[model samples]
Target: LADYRYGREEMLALYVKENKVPEELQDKEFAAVLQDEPLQPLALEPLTEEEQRNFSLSVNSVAVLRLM
Candidate 1:
């Protein structure tokens, strides 16, 4: 036995009934070059004082969104 997945009811039954696994796969080939340059990772700016006020506004919005 292994860790059970979420949608096990349908896919699990089909594979077990067939007594085999799927091999007809969509094999795609791709080649690419990945390049990256790292920048400053620190937060030089500070948090806004208005965000605390925004929190209550966000909390108040929950009711209106669900009040539908």
Candidate 2:
């Protein structure tokens, strides 16, 4: 599992590289890019309670093994 931390400004820049945001509009400011071509909102999905516990356990186990 990996952490996913992103913001609109950064995402807009990334979208430009992905070709999702128009190349011609790449030079535009954050607000303009969003106003001209808005991106679809992404659904946030957090790990379930049980999954969270399991993930914690997995991380601890890795840390223990690394110390050996």
Top model number, TM-score:
2
Candidate 2 local lDDT, 26-65, one digit each (tens): 6656555454545443423466899778767665566688
- Residue lDDT tens for model 1, 1-68: 66975564555344322323233322232213211333222233344778657765665576688887
Error in Å for residue 28 of model 2: 39
TM-score of 2: 0.24
lDDT score of model 1?
0.44
Output the lDDT of residue 58, model 2. Answer: 68
The best candidate in terms of lDDT: 2
Query: Each model's TM-score?
Result: 0.20, 0.24
Candidate 2 segments exceeding 4 Å error: 1-43, 59-68
TM-score of 1: 0.20
Worst 10 residues of 2 by lDDT: 35-44
